[PDB]
Amino acid sequence: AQPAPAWTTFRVGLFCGIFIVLNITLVLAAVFKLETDRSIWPLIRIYRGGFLLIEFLFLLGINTYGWRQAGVNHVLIFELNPRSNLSHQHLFEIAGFLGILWCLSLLACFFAPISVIPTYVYPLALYGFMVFFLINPTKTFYYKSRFWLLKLLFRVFTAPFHKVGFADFWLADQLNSLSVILMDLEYMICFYSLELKWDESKGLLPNNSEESGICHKYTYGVRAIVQCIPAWLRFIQCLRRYRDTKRAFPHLVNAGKYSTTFFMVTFAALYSTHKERGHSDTMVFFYLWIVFYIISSCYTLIWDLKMDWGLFDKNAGENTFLREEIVYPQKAYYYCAIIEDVILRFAWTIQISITSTTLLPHSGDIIATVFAPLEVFRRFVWNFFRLENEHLNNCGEFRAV
Amino acid sequence: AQPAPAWTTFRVGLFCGIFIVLNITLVLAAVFKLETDRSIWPLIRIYRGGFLLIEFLFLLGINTYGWRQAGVNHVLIFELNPRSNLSHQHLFEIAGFLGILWCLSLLACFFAPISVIPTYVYPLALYGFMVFFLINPTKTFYYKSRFWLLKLLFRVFTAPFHKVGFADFWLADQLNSLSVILMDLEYMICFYSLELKWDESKGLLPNNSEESGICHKYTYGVRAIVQCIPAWLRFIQCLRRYRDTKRAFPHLVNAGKYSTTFFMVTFAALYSTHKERGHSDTMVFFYLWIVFYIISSCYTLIWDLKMDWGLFDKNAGENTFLREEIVYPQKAYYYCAIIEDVILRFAWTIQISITSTTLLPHSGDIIATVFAPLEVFRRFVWNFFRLENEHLNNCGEFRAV
Ligand SMILES: CCCCCCCCCCCCCCCCCC(=O)OC[C@H](COP(=O)(O)OCCN)OC(=O)CCCCCCCCCCCCCCCCC
Ligand SMILES: CCCCCCCCCCCCCCCCCC(=O)OC[C@H](COP(=O)(O)OCCN)OC(=O)CCCCCCCCCCCCCCCCC
Ligand SMILES: CCCCCCCCCCCCCCCCCC(=O)OC[C@H](COP(=O)(O)OCCN)OC(=O)CCCCCCCCCCCCCCCCC
Ligand SMILES: CCCCCCCCCCCCCCCCCC(=O)OC[C@H](COP(=O)(O)OCCN)OC(=O)CCCCCCCCCCCCCCCCC
Ligand SMILES: CCCCCCCCCCCCCCCCCC(=O)OC[C@H](COP(=O)(O)OCCN)OC(=O)CCCCCCCCCCCCCCCCC
Ligand SMILES: CCCCCCCCCCCCCCCCCC(=O)OC[C@H](COP(=O)(O)OCCN)OC(=O)CCCCCCCCCCCCCCCCC
Ligand SMILES: CC(C)CCC[C@@H](C)[C@H]1CC[C@H]2[C@@H]3CC=C4C[C@@H](O)CC[C@]4(C)[C@H]3CC[C@]12C
Ligand SMILES: CC(C)CCC[C@@H](C)[C@H]1CC[C@H]2[C@@H]3CC=C4C[C@@H](O)CC[C@]4(C)[C@H]3CC[C@]12C
Ligand SMILES: CC(C)CCC[C@@H](C)[C@H]1CC[C@H]2[C@@H]3CC=C4C[C@@H](O)CC[C@]4(C)[C@H]3CC[C@]12C
Ligand SMILES: CC(C)CCC[C@@H](C)[C@H]1CC[C@H]2[C@@H]3CC=C4C[C@@H](O)CC[C@]4(C)[C@H]3CC[C@]12C
Ligand SMILES: CC(C)CCC[C@@H](C)[C@H]1CC[C@H]2[C@@H]3CC=C4C[C@@H](O)CC[C@]4(C)[C@H]3CC[C@]12C
Ligand SMILES: CC(C)CCC[C@@H](C)[C@H]1CC[C@H]2[C@@H]3CC=C4C[C@@H](O)CC[C@]4(C)[C@H]3CC[C@]12C
């Protein structure tokens, strides 16, 4: 727990201040300097993934600070080398720098500083730089942590063939909460391949109010696939865990919890096709999808409140509807977090598990865009208590002890 | 030399980043969003004093860092309590915060966010806040250092009646290099009292290209008074030092050095009045002014290079045209600083000691505005070697040892 250098604290302060001013400038430019004849929704859908990644990195820095101060040893749990472990200052600085780049790209999208370069180049340059920064081979910027994250991502995207650790499970869960990023990446790819209108100088902001492009639609059904990998990876990891340990519990229950998302998205997409093609069983599909909903949310919610966090423990005693041992300084944190998980555990499904693979509401874009940050916030608060439960009493039996 | 808290490093980083982004926005607004039918010069003259104060505080933070790392003990020299001495982080943070306020006021002047609030309120608001922050009685923001600076300013503005310390002499010299701030304050007062055009919504940016207002003119001659005040304070302090010690040297020589400014500005204003009224001795007055110039610059320059810094010492030996003892890590610093002092010692005179009390050139405003930051930079570099000389071998005999 060596203190971070004063230079990196200055750097994170600098990046956070630049981010604040650029954000205020971006908000002011959006409200003042804009023209209401073309749909801004493609831009929002392109940049929502980047914004969610920035927010996730910032909240993960907050999580690392909370873990360090509370007492939960995330270094041992994650199986990291104690010498080069990232303090919360480094995560804050990375989040701030990538937020600087995101704000600059969005500003360039709002008004084109250079008339020669087309406005659709900016979203692509931002994510290209993000990928190159993540895949940078030269040992210059956070090389140890970056390479460790690359190994972890490789292991999590090839889940069945690798023995699971806590890092793999944890990153798979984070991906499960970050499905919006994958869906936005798929939307970016489809939009640039079909509907971008490369020739047009303002192609990414088309005039047609009617969204006839199939990119926001789901005719091919690949959108369900790209939305469903984040749960499929966890399902396969749970199956591999059971195959390795030959324990029906708690791995098949978890696999069922993660496979509820399969039926969720399935029936959502079938409802989308059935209603947009004008069939007589659209109401039946909607009712069956609602039926698989509620079970999906309650399954995930009870899992979060009982096994992920360890709360509602019988032997709590003085603590009410909590665990016997608590490491966070204030007991009200758990009580507020339970209500937060309850409220955001029904919202997250409604907003991005659905409503983005089916076009039931017109305001679905607004709901998804406004609730995905609360999805990442729910994941951020879930991280605190899952890691705290891991430190106190081993869950999932990742550790030998 | 206790390290500054990580929170204050984050704060100075935040303020510096906000300052950088606000400065870039200000430059872009000036070059893009402006109207070329009114004189921007009143705004420049109002805000130049604030900018010079921000730059002086930032460069003084740099000076404090250099003093701490080099070895020169500024705490003992200034006679400060070692417990509550300001590290360079605090000076950097104060400079950054006041720069945030200056940038916000300038931005509000460029475009009026509130049509109800007249645009001439913003610089008045900024300078009123600066004064209130300096004279804040509540022990909230840097109360110890602020009250110490208030006592020092009171002592320096009542120079003859107080025994001089190093702090009083040092602040008097800083004022001598910051005469532009006093001149800008006087211009602000005169402009608001006569030429502001309170009724006009854009009074501080008048349409008339011809600057017929007497504020930029010197009919009353009070501008020369407020410009000679910083040198008058040092002259009176040196006279008081001689009266206290009864040593003709080195106090009467210094008093004459500071008195050269009196004749400088005298003959400058006399040339202004003589040329703007059409008399036959304007050339004679110009020649007398220029004659007293060169002597003033060389007097101050030789003083700086011989007694202030202690350079050109006979016993230097291996060091060429330097002193026998040096505490700064690189010897090239002194050699570059000598040339810098010479060039800026002529430049500062020719730019602000004149050309702001007489209207000889039309581009005089540009020259003064572009060279006053070099006057604060020259003072910043002079601070390093004056304090280093004070630490090495007592100059001025402020200390008993
Ligand atoms: C109008 C347009 C929109 C405007 C807003 C745009 C985005 C806003 C983003 C603001 C920036 C947030 C991140 C900046 C916080 C960085 C904190 C930091 O580095 O502080 C240093 C502090 C001291 O460290 P110490 O505890 O001494 O030990 C360190 C061990 N080496 O170390 C610590 O980190 C410990 C103390 C802080 C712990 C984390 C808490 C910081 C985040 C709090 C919430 C931030 C804002 C959230 C949303 C605001 C709106 C509701
Ligand atoms: C160094 C670290 C910190 C970085 C700080 C960056 C600060 C940026 C602050 C932006 C604030 C903008 C302020 C604008 C003031 C008013 C300007 C205006 O109204 O016009 C905008 C101008 C249009 O000009 P025009 O219409 O010809 O003139 C109109 C006459 N009134 O439009 C223009 O031509 C200029 C618009 C300003 C351009 C700002 C954004 C630049 C983006 C550059 C490329 C970004 C892409 C990089 C992607 C990286 C990916 C990793
Ligand atoms: C294709 C779709 C992708 C969807 C999103 C996928 C990425 C999710 C976010 C990345 C994961 C965040 C960090 C995960 C670990 C956090 C826990 C932690 O504190 O780990 C500390 C770890 C220590 O590293 P260290 O000690 O150096 O390693 C051992 C040394 N031999 O150090 C770390 O924390 C390592 C973190 C590495 C640096 C942060 C990530 C860099 C930026 C990522 C940009 C991704 C670009 C995606 C573009 C598409 C967006 C639409
Ligand atoms: C386009 C429009 C205009 C854009 C520009 C607008 C204005 C630019 C202003 C930039 C901000 C400058 C000030 C920020 C520097 C702050 C440095 C800082 O706090 O760093 C922490 C560093 C570490 O401290 P340490 O030595 O470990 O010991 C401390 C003891 N407690 O502690 C230290 O301070 C030591 C290391 C640094 C020492 C001071 C050097 C900093 C200043 C260098 C020059 C800055 C820019 C000058 C002009 C640039 C253009 C030519
Ligand atoms: C919190 C810490 C950090 C603080 C960060 C502050 C961020 C400020 C960033 C400013 C960037 C401005 C970006 C402007 C984008 C383009 C806007 C534009 O072109 O119009 C400006 C707008 C005029 O609007 P209008 O002409 O009606 O509409 C034109 C239609 N295209 O004009 C307007 O009406 C709005 C112009 C923007 C106003 C910015 C400055 C606000 C100043 C508030 C008061 C300041 C005084 C405080 C003094 C304190 C003294 C101690
Ligand atoms: C009317 C025309 C005025 C013209 C300009 C006059 C002001 C010049 C600039 C102010 C002087 C700068 C600082 C001088 C000392 C620097 C040397 C140093 O390092 O001092 C450390 C000192 C320690 O303080 P401490 O230890 O707390 O005191 C003993 C505790 N019992 O701590 C300090 O450094 C104390 C510094 C106090 C905080 C900085 C100043 C606050 C901002 C000043 C705003 C002035 C507003 C002027 C408005 C008009 C502009 C046109
Ligand atoms: C009611 C809902 C919508 C909002 C309330 C939940 C939020 C604000 C709560 C829930 C859990 C809380 C966190 C729980 C534990 C930690 C670690 C501790 O060392 C500092 C506080 C910190 C970082 C808390 C911050 C606030 C927090 C994130
Ligand atoms: C993951 C990060 C890098 C963002 C994804 C951007 C990249 C992979 C995508 C976005 C736009 C895409 C291009 C869009 C259109 C075409 C034209 C088609 O006839 C061949 C493929 C090609 C040339 C695509 C290649 C891949 C591409 C460049
Ligand atoms: C939306 C819902 C209804 C979809 C169906 C998924 C759920 C209900 C199913 C899928 C796989 C199932 C599990 C398969 C195997 C076993 C092992 C046994 O020892 C306990 C029950 C348990 C753990 C089952 C519980 C129910 C389960 C988790
Ligand atoms: C194999 C089990 C464990 C997981 C299944 C998850 C994936 C493969 C499922 C879940 C949702 C499914 C989609 C639901 C709806 C559509 C639209 C329809 O017009 C064609 C099939 C298609 C495109 C399905 C393809 C397969 C799909 C994406
Ligand atoms: C939503 C409903 C209708 C269907 C799915 C919920 C049921 C089948 C499952 C989902 C998660 C399950 C819980 C998961 C973990 C535990 C902890 C264990 O020590 C006691 C049983 C208990 C508390 C399980 C009880 C049954 C449970 C609540
Ligand atoms: C040729 C002219 C115009 C410009 C050159 C002069 C400038 C760049 C030089 C002259 C004196 C120099 C300073 C002298 C001493 C110190 C203290 C040391 O611990 C760090 C470097 C630092 C802070 C130097 C920075 C650069 C400096 C300010």
Ligand SMILES: CC(C)CCC[C@@H](C)[C@H]1CC[C@H]2[C@@H]3CC=C4C[C@@H](O)CC[C@]4(C)[C@H]3CC[C@]12C
């Ligand atoms: C030193 C800091 C506070 C900046 C100086 C600003 C203050 C002191 C100045 C600037 C503008 C000035 C005002 C300008 C005009 C008038 C009208 C006159 O008939 C009476 C004085 C009065 C009302 C002045 C009072 C002093 C004043 C408010």
Ligand SMILES: CC(C)CCC[C@@H](C)[C@H]1CC[C@H]2[C@@H]3CC=C4C[C@@H](O)CC[C@]4(C)[C@H]3CC[C@]12C
């Ligand atoms: C621009 C110039 C010419 C203006 C005149 C000011 C200078 C030259 C004058 C003013 C007062 C003078 C000083 C008055 C008294 C003495 C004391 C004596 O023991 C040594 C000479 C010395 C120290 C004089 C040197 C010259 C002096 C400094």
Ligand SMILES: CC(C)CCC[C@@H](C)[C@H]1CC[C@H]2[C@@H]3CC=C4C[C@@H](O)CC[C@]4(C)[C@H]3CC[C@]12C
């Ligand atoms: C007394 C000695 C030590 C220092 C003298 C410095 C001051 C008081 C001097 C130096 C420059 C002088 C000014 C120079 C020129 C003008 C313009 C003229 O039309 C009237 C006199 C007037 C306004 C002078 C007033 C007094 C003045 C300001």
Ligand SMILES: CC(C)CCC[C@@H](C)[C@H]1CC[C@H]2[C@@H]3CC=C4C[C@@H](O)CC[C@]4(C)[C@H]3CC[C@]12C
């Ligand atoms: C510009 C000219 C024409 C007039 C003013 C310069 C003359 C009179 C003065 C101004 C400053 C003076 C110097 C100030 C300090 C010292 C240090 C001492 O140990 C030797 C003499 C020496 C080096 C002085 C020599 C004379 C000097 C150079």
Ligand SMILES: CCCCC/C=C/C/C=C\C/C=C/C/C=C/CCCC(=O)O
């Ligand atoms: C923690 C919560 C964070 C919330 C962050 C919010 C992000 C974006 C918010 C709202 C999205 C609204 C966009 C306005 C656009 C409307 C489309 C109509 C115009 C048209 O059809 O042309």
Ligand SMILES: CCCCC/C=C/C/C=C\C/C=C/C/C=C/CCCC(=O)O
């Ligand atoms: C270390 C050096 C720092 C320099 C910082 C620079 C500051 C300001 C620079 C230049 C001032 C130029 C202003 C342009 C205005 C011209 C007046 C003509 C227009 C009119 O008559 O309407």
